[PDB]
Design an enzyme around this catalytic site. Structure first.
Site, PDB file in Angstrom:
ATOM      1  N   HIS B  77      -8.280  -4.128  34.859  1.00 36.71           N
ATOM      2  CA  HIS B  77      -9.264  -3.127  34.574  1.00 36.71           C
ATOM      3  C   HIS B  77     -10.447  -3.647  33.855  1.00 36.71           C
ATOM      4  O   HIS B  77     -11.543  -3.165  34.111  1.00 36.71           O
ATOM      5  CB  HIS B  77      -8.565  -1.905  33.929  1.00 36.71           C
ATOM      6  CG  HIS B  77      -7.810  -1.109  34.966  1.00 36.71           C
ATOM      7  ND1 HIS B  77      -7.684   0.244  34.928  1.00 36.71           N
ATOM      8  CD2 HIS B  77      -7.149  -1.505  36.075  1.00 36.71           C
ATOM      9  CE1 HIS B  77      -7.004   0.671  35.993  1.00 36.71           C
ATOM     10  NE2 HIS B  77      -6.671  -0.389  36.711  1.00 36.71           N
ATOM     11  N   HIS B 244       0.614  -6.091  42.265  1.00 39.92           N
ATOM     12  CA  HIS B 244       1.762  -5.184  42.491  1.00 39.92           C
ATOM     13  C   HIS B 244       3.098  -5.891  42.750  1.00 39.92           C
ATOM     14  O   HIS B 244       4.095  -5.221  43.050  1.00 39.92           O
ATOM     15  CB  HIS B 244       1.429  -4.082  43.532  1.00 39.92           C
ATOM     16  CG  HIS B 244       0.285  -3.248  43.117  1.00 39.92           C
ATOM     17  ND1 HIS B 244      -0.365  -2.382  43.962  1.00 39.92           N
ATOM     18  CD2 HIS B 244      -0.371  -3.190  41.926  1.00 39.92           C
ATOM     19  CE1 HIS B 244      -1.328  -1.765  43.290  1.00 39.92           C
ATOM     20  NE2 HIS B 244      -1.349  -2.239  42.057  1.00 39.92           N
TER      21      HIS B 244
HETATM   22  C1  HEM Z   1      -6.756  -1.199  45.703  1.00 41.30           C
HETATM   23  C2  HEM Z   1      -6.747  -1.730  44.518  1.00 41.30           C
HETATM   24  C3  HEM Z   1      -5.798  -1.138  43.565  1.00 41.30           C
HETATM   25  C4  HEM Z   1      -5.288   0.095  43.464  1.00 41.30           C
HETATM   26  C5  HEM Z   1      -5.805   1.332  44.123  1.00 41.30           C
HETATM   27  C6  HEM Z   1      -4.445   0.067  42.290  1.00 41.30           C
HETATM   28  C7  HEM Z   1      -3.755   1.209  41.846  1.00 41.30           C
HETATM   29  C8  HEM Z   1      -2.913   1.240  40.721  1.00 41.30           C
HETATM   30  C9  HEM Z   1      -2.335   2.393  40.134  1.00 41.30           C
HETATM   31  C10 HEM Z   1      -2.555   3.848  40.469  1.00 41.30           C
HETATM   32  C11 HEM Z   1      -1.439   1.951  39.182  1.00 41.30           C
HETATM   33  C12 HEM Z   1      -0.659   2.853  38.287  1.00 41.30           C
HETATM   34  C13 HEM Z   1      -1.211   3.248  36.915  1.00 41.30           C
HETATM   35  C14 HEM Z   1      -0.132   3.952  36.125  1.00 41.30           C
HETATM   36  O1  HEM Z   1       0.249   5.042  36.576  1.00 41.30           O
HETATM   37  O2  HEM Z   1       0.349   3.359  35.161  1.00 41.30           O
HETATM   38  C15 HEM Z   1      -1.514   0.542  39.137  1.00 41.30           C
HETATM   39  C16 HEM Z   1      -0.691  -0.280  38.370  1.00 41.30           C
HETATM   40  C17 HEM Z   1      -0.830  -1.645  38.352  1.00 41.30           C
HETATM   41  N1  HEM Z   1      -1.669  -2.422  39.074  1.00 41.30           N
HETATM   42 FE1  HEM Z   1      -2.866  -1.829  40.504  1.00 41.30          FE
HETATM   43  N2  HEM Z   1      -4.185  -1.186  41.921  1.00 41.30           N
HETATM   44  C18 HEM Z   1      -5.119  -1.920  42.563  1.00 41.30           C
HETATM   45  C19 HEM Z   1      -5.272  -3.250  42.411  1.00 41.30           C
HETATM   46  C20 HEM Z   1      -4.657  -4.046  41.441  1.00 41.30           C
HETATM   47  C21 HEM Z   1      -5.026  -5.424  41.203  1.00 41.30           C
HETATM   48  C22 HEM Z   1      -6.188  -6.177  41.849  1.00 41.30           C
HETATM   49  C23 HEM Z   1      -4.240  -5.891  40.174  1.00 41.30           C
HETATM   50  C24 HEM Z   1      -4.108  -7.181  39.520  1.00 41.30           C
HETATM   51  C25 HEM Z   1      -4.333  -8.318  40.050  1.00 41.30           C
HETATM   52  C26 HEM Z   1      -3.307  -4.795  39.856  1.00 41.30           C
HETATM   53  C27 HEM Z   1      -2.208  -4.867  38.961  1.00 41.30           C
HETATM   54  C28 HEM Z   1      -1.478  -3.718  38.604  1.00 41.30           C
HETATM   55  C29 HEM Z   1      -0.343  -3.775  37.724  1.00 41.30           C
HETATM   56  C30 HEM Z   1       0.199  -5.012  37.082  1.00 41.30           C
HETATM   57  C31 HEM Z   1       0.049  -2.481  37.541  1.00 41.30           C
HETATM   58  C32 HEM Z   1       1.258  -2.081  36.707  1.00 41.30           C
HETATM   59  C33 HEM Z   1       0.954  -1.459  35.371  1.00 41.30           C
HETATM   60  C34 HEM Z   1       2.194  -1.339  34.518  1.00 41.30           C
HETATM   61  O3  HEM Z   1       3.280  -1.982  34.754  1.00 41.30           O
HETATM   62  O4  HEM Z   1       2.127  -0.585  33.493  1.00 41.30           O
HETATM   63  N3  HEM Z   1      -3.530  -3.732  40.738  1.00 41.30           N
HETATM   64  N4  HEM Z   1      -2.286   0.101  40.174  1.00 41.30           N
END
Ligand code: HEM
Ligand code: HEM
Ligand SMILES: [Cl-]
Ligand SMILES: [Cl-]
Ligand code: NA
Ligand code: NA
Lengths: 713, 713
Positions: B77, B244
């Site tokens: 973020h 993810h």
């Molecule tokens: C299309 C691009 C992306 C979409 C739409 C997206 C969407 C989201 C959403 C909705 C969550 C959940 C937030 C929550 O409810 O806690 C999340 C979690 C996460 N995303 Fe993404 N994401 C994107 C790209 C990325 C990228 C580029 C990274 C890192 C390189 C990333 C790493 C993470 C991680 C590590 C979590 C887990 C958070 C946790 O364990 O608390 N994501 N993502």
């Protein structure tokens, strides 16, 4: 662009504390306006201004061939935004040339007046500020017309952006009272800190209160607004009748012919506004207020004809060509000259507010005395004019140039001259030692010096520790100043002073004003020692002690701190949240956000709070100078909740055990809430910050102690 | 409290140019963050970060016992607000901790993540910025979970207030397209410079475009937003599938249980927000996005399970507990661990946007390749993560510490090392003389150096005269750069350079990058001589020449000036007034209002305008360095009117004769209109100002020439 103010319209606004940065200033870091002015050939400027009065420009032709009236109006409006309640407004920063003042409806066509002055501004450059030039031009207009002024002081440095001033809540120019953002309540009570009856007026409505042309009721508004600009009945009568001895109003046709104010005009207007489609749009056809009044038979010459007319005729209500209410002497011959056609003459006319001077009982007595004794009127007007145009200039030490009046006036909060050698560094060290040996505590010392120094406000440069007015009425009895604790400290410091002064050779003595400050410095030094650190707080002698007879008690009332977040003090309950009132006070003290943050967190642990309240005292080593406030405020091991008793007091409890650790107010906890203030708190609450905290605290403490020391400027 | 913005919502806003003053900065004037960081024990910090990952705090309990997912999200973020169109956003200033980013809905519960880092920030103080710490923490999370990173560079200095960024015009968080302030028009065309599909999102809507769960159409939004954040298809698939691999989403109950975001929360929340009334409001009960997906069988360990699941199951549309669209694996066993109850397992789930990686044809090929060749996936994700988190850091010369990768990447716009002695002062004087003897004009010289240096933007520190990229594609062909005139200057300079270099001993040579800037200096010097003034323009050698192969032409395209007020240039017609685009460019150049003012008025008289337009050339001595622009602009003898043909071009005519004196654009005339800019113009247009104007012009010229000179920092 949606902005943070749009999403979060009630978050606290810090931007007022970082106005006036070196970034926005075109002049070099080392530019000193007083140095520049002191070399100005002021006589040469005044000669060019005198020539200007009768040099008409075709784009705004001079009434009667003479711009003097227009320029007096300009200078009175420059000065006439002033409010005693906070010291804001006034001529001292040349703010009429910035928004919003440049575009207030009451300032219509003063954009033309300012433009007439550009050739002279350009000729003399940085050696005469716009601020000084607006006032000087009104003086020269008065002088050119036969009026002897009381004098003039230079030294108003130019500013480079708008000040942030609360001018009211109305969203419509000239909104009559009773609307959703009414500045009135109750029996016509105007809200503090306002000093005008409608948004965009200087003081009152010239047709009468909310346009009702009743001289008697208009007088009520005159008196109230003028009082809020620090003028009493005699000053008010003299200023209104004096100003309306000259010139004329402009209302040749309907107001709907007048276009956009300067800030709204097209770029081709090049900073001017109120372009009019009525006939030629200027000169004989000018429209400014919509009124069409010429007060005297000689509008370009000082006379006593204003009062001759006011009392010599009976008045009847009529309408200008733009439809505004005004008054005419129908029994009179056509004795008033026309501004452009030498074949026309007019009957005497007056505004409703001019007739106030005759039909209000208290004003009538004064007006009658000035009518019968015009030399008294001239003297009163000269004195009031000087006060009007200098009221926000600060201590006489700031006054520059060859025309400063030698007479010392009570309104100036005068400081006696110092006629004796000053203490030196060794003497200061000896006095610090005696103060600490007397048994006065860090808390008493810090609180007393804070109380003395923190009355300063940079808006009008009133207040501060010079004069030792803390020992006089009314400051000694202010609730914030803890009158019985204060009296005991001052008695001890006065005995120290008497002993030291009695032991000296050769005329050396210390003032109580200086000793109160030095004693505060000793307290800060002892607090740092308590924390394990040897520091010297800087100290500049030379303050002097003013007498009660040199102190106007009623004028001093507006300086009383009713909210002082630095002492966790709120005198009563306000609509405005306490954290907003903290930033407002920081602004008056000329503090940045970092300086506000460090100063508050040190004051809390030094025992500066009124009444020794524990609110925000987040330390177990009170009276030691440490960063404890920040380290404990930012500790996530503590959870905060409003108390049941008071929503503005908070309990901090251990998150795991529930045990009570601290209490705090909004002023304390804002430092843990606001995203910008919390980032500052973090710097001072970090493990590497003990040295920085102490250094920065001493620097800001010393800044506060020196706010009124224009003798060292 | 009515403000100037309320009365005059369209007046130009200069406050953006005086952000980041020394007033709002708590650190001393001389604080140098690079020096502080260079002494930080980075290894010690990393150890503390590793210990943090599994030290669960009861106010925000760690999913699966490990904060690593939460922190990777936090870092992605922080970096994910970046837009290539203007370089604004990104991780480089730590703006996540300020409004509005701290309270974007897509940043929900990242206030918790940042608070978990306070103890470490506090421990290391000023030697590690928040900005650096957010990125470092994401790296350490990856490492803790078994993923080897490509590297890390420190040097992101903290900032102390919100940046002014245009994030869109919508007045409602998460507003779907086609509203009154739609960021979309046409065939889903997103307005420049925006790089997200809705207000308050990082890139796309995880449910699908405007909430429609179609993976194929979501893919289109992902590709477009990620391209606007400088990422191609391979980098995009690597980042989404990489991120993810870890962690989970949070949607345990209805979103109506979650309350105010941090900037709207009560003071007792102490900087946190989104407090939830759903069961315990945290941990197993957390609500963040409203989605409830856990991607892999081992959410706290690097694996190849993301692509195993994506391709190994068929997907069925379903709803989270909060009602959001998501996907579940048809027929699968309960193989995904629960974050808190060891007795529960769950079926594999995916977001719509994860299924994009399989159902978009171009992404499917890449995902399939990463699925079959997981070592390729890991290396691409490492490289893309590094790019993601460093893209706004500027030249490699800014990168600090022991983990900086040695490999030079195309995206960094790399500059070759200098391997030879530099020219000295005598040599600089010899080259300036050869340049002036060649016949190149002041206009050609000043224009060429302007064109080369003024591509810099402080938002992401790209651009500037280092590299001599002005001679390469695409800058040599930009319309603003006057390609045919530019080619003739560069040919002449390249001949001078070859002859100089050919005559040297011992390896000394001058780069073309340096000679372009030196030659501009010579033009400014000659202009001052033309005006009768002796001036010396400072010059620092050391730029090197980049190759075409070190210059990614597509990435260079976003640096093209389509509006450059300093050259009176507008490529086409824009909604935004030209004066607003001028202030935007001054902000990218890091200029204050006074610096913008002096630079424009000098450029005008030096002949820097594109196409040699006479607009704003208010002098009869073109190519002489004088304050003529200001003196003539402010002459009330001249009246201005928009032309019939074009309302944004103006004629200045003698007010008395009607004769045509000048023409000007809005960029030119705003300096005589806006009340703050006019007050600056007045300083430079005064009779005492010629020397100040020259000296201030040379200073800002040199500042612009050195904007990218981080090798001298
Ligand atoms: C299309 C691009 C992306 C979409 C739409 C997206 C969407 C989201 C959403 C909705 C969550 C959940 C937030 C929550 O409810 O806690 C999340 C979690 C996460 N995303 Fe993404 N994401 C994107 C790209 C990325 C990228 C580029 C990274 C890192 C390189 C990333 C790493 C993470 C991680 C590590 C979590 C887990 C958070 C946790 O364990 O608390 N994501 N993502
Ligand atoms: C109750 C207080 C006052 C009211 C309501 C008031 C009202 C006005 C109005 C409506 C005008 C006409 C504006 C125009 O149409 O051009 C004006 C003109 C003027 N006022 Fe006042 N005034 C007040 C006090 C003052 C004071 C304190 C002074 C100066 C000491 C001043 C000096 C003048 C002068 C010289 C003009 C003439 C302008 C010209 O010749 O262009 N007035 N007044
Ligand atoms: Cl003010
Ligand atoms: Cl930004
Ligand atoms: Na003031
Ligand atoms: Na950026």
């Amino acid at each position: 662009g949606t902005s943070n103010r749009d999403w979060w319209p009630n978050q606290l606004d810090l931007s007022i504390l970082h106005r006036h940065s070196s970034l926005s200033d075109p002049m070099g870091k080392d530019f000193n306006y007083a140095q520049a002015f002191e070399k100005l050939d002021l006589a040469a400027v005044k000669r060019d201004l005198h020539a200007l009065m009768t040099t008409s420009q075709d784009w705004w032709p001079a009434d009667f061939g003479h711009y003097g009236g227009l320029f007096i109006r300009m200078a009175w409006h420059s000065a006439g935004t002033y409010r005693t309640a906070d010291g804001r407004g006034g001529a001292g920063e040349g703010q009429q040339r910035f928004a919003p003042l440049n575009s207030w409806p009451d300032n219509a066509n003063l954009d033309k007046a300012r433009r007439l002055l550009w050739p002279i501004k350009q000729k003399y450059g940085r050696a005469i500020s716009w601020a000084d030039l607006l006032i000087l031009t009104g003086n020269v207009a008065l002088e050119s017309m036969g009026f002897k002024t009381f004098g003039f002081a230079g030294g108003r440095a130019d500013t480079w952006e708008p000040e942030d001033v609360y001018w009211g809540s109305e969203k419509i120019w000239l909104e009559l009272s009773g609307g959703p953002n009414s500045r009135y309540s109750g029996d016509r009570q105007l809200e503090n800190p306002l000093a005008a009856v409608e948004m965009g007026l200087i003081y009152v409505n010239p047709e009468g209160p909310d346009g009702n042309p009743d001289p008697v009721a208009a007088a009520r508004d005159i008196r109230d607004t003028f009082a809020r600009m620090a003028m009493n009945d005699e000053e008010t009568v003299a200023l209104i009748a004096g100003g309306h001895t000259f010139g004329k109003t402009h209302g040749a046709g309907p107001a709907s012919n007048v276009g956009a104010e300067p800030e709204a005009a097209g770029i081709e207007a090049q900073g001017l506004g109120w372009k009019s489609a009525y006939r030629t749009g200027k000169g004989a056809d000018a429209i400014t207020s919509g009124l069409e009044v010429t007060w005297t038979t000689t509008p370009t010459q000082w006379s006593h004809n204003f009062f001759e007319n006011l009392f010599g005729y009976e008045w009847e209500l009529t309408k200008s060509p733009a439809g505004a209410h005004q008054w005419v002497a129908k029994g009179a011959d056509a004795v008033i000259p026309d501004a452009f056609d030498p074949s026309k003459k007019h009957r005497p006319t007056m505004l409703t507010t001019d007739l106030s001077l005759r039909f209000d009982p208290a004003y009538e007595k004064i007006s009658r005395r000035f009518h019968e004794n015009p030399e008294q009127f001239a003297d009163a007007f000269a004195r009031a004019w000087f006060k009007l145009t200098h009221r926000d200039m600060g201590p006489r030490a700031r006054y520059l140039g060859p025309e400063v009046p030698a007479e010392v006036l009570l309104w100036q909060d005068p400081i006696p001259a110092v006629d004796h050698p000053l203490i030196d560094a060794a003497d200061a060290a000896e006095l610090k030692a005696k103060v600490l040996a007397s048994g006065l505590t860090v808390s008493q010392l810090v609180s007393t010096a804070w109380a003395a120094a923190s009355t300063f406000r940079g808006s009008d440069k009133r207040g501060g520790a010079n004069g030792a007015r803390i020992r006089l009425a009314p400051q000694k009895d202010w609730e914030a100043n803890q009158p019985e604790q204060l009296a005991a400290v001052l008695e001890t410091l006065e005995a120290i002073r008497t002993a030291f002064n009695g032991a000296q050779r050769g005329g050396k003595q210390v003032s109580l004003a200086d000793l109160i400050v030095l004693a505060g410095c000793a307290g800060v030094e002892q607090a740092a020692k308590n924390a394990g650190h040897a520091v010297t707080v800087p100290f500049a002698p030379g303050r002097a002690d003013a007498s009660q007879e040199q102190t106007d008690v009623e004028s001093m009332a507006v300086l009383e701190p009713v909210a002082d977040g630095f002492r966790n003090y709120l005198k009563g309950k306000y609509r405005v949240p306490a954290e907003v009132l903290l930033v407002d006070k920081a602004q008056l003290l000329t503090l940045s956000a970092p300086e506000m943050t460090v100063l508050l967190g040190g004051l809390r642990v030094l025992g500066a709070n009124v009444g020794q309240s524990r609110h925000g005292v987040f330390t177990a080593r009170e009276q030691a100078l440490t960063n404890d406030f920040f380290v404990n405020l930012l500790d996530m091991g503590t959870e905060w909740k409003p108390t049941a008793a008071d929503a503005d007091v908070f309990e901090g409890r251990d998150r795991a055990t529930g045990e009570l650790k601290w209490t705090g107010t909004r002023v304390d906890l804002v430092f843990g809430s606001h995203s910008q203030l919390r980032a500052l708190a973090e710097v001072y609450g970090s493990a590497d910050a003990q040295e920085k905290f102490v250094r920065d605290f001493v620097a800001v403490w010393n800044k506060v102690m020196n706010l009124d020391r224009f003798d060292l400027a």
